[PDB]
Amino acid sequence: GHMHDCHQVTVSRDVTLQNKERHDCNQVCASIDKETENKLNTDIIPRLTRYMSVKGNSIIARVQQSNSDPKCSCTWRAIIWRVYKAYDENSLNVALHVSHPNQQIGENPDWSLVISNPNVHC
């Protein structure tokens, strides 16, 4: 019944883009694929580095859809392989919106974070 000291995190970006034009939402969302990567590497990973046992994440991937809705729901997911279990899902989510302390202007409202697998080693 071995015990797990790290957990695996899926960090997600969730953006709604205007599509008054009624184009493919894969193509509308693709517009800010590069933005999302640059945001992942320059802000999101850095501010979660503190919590990882070992540096290590998957390449951020967009979720394919099949629609042309007036508002496009765009979602990217990346996986961070090992984060100390000591840091709960809530504290990791907070780390996304707040850095400097007592802060009131939240950042990255578009970003969220789950535990993808409770049972990882470091």
Residue numbers in the entry: 1 to 122
Quote the study on this structure.
The Dothideomycete Leptosphaeria maculans, causal agent of oilseed rape stem canker or blackleg disease, is one of the fungal pathogens in which suppression of ETI by the presence of an AVR gene has been demonstrated. Among them, AvrLm4-7 suppresses Rlm3-mediated resistance triggered by AvrLm3 and Rlm9-mediated resistance triggered by AvrLm5-9. Surprisingly, despite low sequence similarity, AvrLm5-9 and AvrLm3 are structural analogues of AvrLm4-7, sharing an anti-parallel β-sheet covered by α-helices. Structure-informed sequence database searches identified a larger number of putative structural analogues among L. maculans effector candidates, including the AVR effector AvrLmS-Lep2, all produced during the early stages of oilseed rape infection, as well as among effector candidates from other phytopathogenic fungi. These structural analogues are named LARS (for Leptosphaeria AviRulence and Suppressing) effectors.
The structure of AvrLm5-9 was solved using iodine single wavelength anomalous diffusion (SAD) signal from a derivative crystal and then refined at 2.14 Å resolution using native data. The structure of AvrLm5-9 consists of a central β-sheet made of three anti-parallel β-strands. An elongated peptide (residues 54 to 64) runs anti-parallel to β-strand 2, but only establishes a few main-chain H-bonds, and therefore is not categorized as a β-strand. One face of the β-sheet is covered by the long connections between the stands. The connection between the β1 and β2 strands is a curved α-helix and the connection between the β3 and β4 strands contains a shorter helix surrounded by two irregular peptide loops. AvrLm5-9 has three disulfide bridges, which are C3-C119, C22-C69 and C26-C71, named SS1, SS2 and SS3, respectively, according to protein numeration without the signal peptide or C22-C138, C41-C88 and C45-C90 according to protein numeration with the signal peptide. The SS1 bridge knits the N- and C-termini together, while the other two disulfide bridges fix the long helix onto the β-sheet. The two last polymorphic residues were mapped onto the AvrLm5-9 3D structure. The mutation leading to virulence towards Rlm9 is situated in the middle of the long helix, and the mutation having no effect on the interaction with Rlm9 and Rlm5 is in a loop connecting β1 and β2. Neither mutation is expected to perturb the 3D structure.
